[PDB]
């Protein structure tokens, strides 16, 4: 897999839209976002 980061971000933005920002604290969101990145790896 050699996906471009713009596409990864478009996905993350779709994720935020589906769950809603107000769904987690920012600490939480960050931990999951870091997991989302190492995910493609």
């Amino acid at each position: 897999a050699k996906i471009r980061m713009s596409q990864k971000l478009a996905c993350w933005q779709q994720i935020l839209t589906t769950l809603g920002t107000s769904s987690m604290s920012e600490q939480e969101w960050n931990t999951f976002f870091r997991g989302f990145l190492e995910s493609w790896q």
């Binding site: 897999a1 596409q7 478009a10 996905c11 779709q14 994720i15 589906t18 999951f32 997991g35 989302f36």
Partner: protein, 54 residues
């Protein structure tokens, strides 16, 4: 739109949060979408299981 009434092309990847997300392409589209597992799994219940089995 993110569910744009197209036919599923591939299931590229997944990521488990409170909801499971599948990162899928659509036929003709060139873009990847995050789609909640539940939606996709009712819509295309077979290509999903394929993705998780293989």
């Amino acid at each position: 739109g993110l569910d744009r009434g197209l036919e599923l092309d591939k299931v590229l990847h997944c990521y488990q949060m409170k909801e499971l997300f599948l990162f899928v392409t659509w036929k003709g589209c060139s873009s990847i979408d995050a789609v909640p597992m539940k939606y996709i799994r009712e819509a295309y219940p077979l290509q999903v299981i394929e993705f998780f089995q293989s």
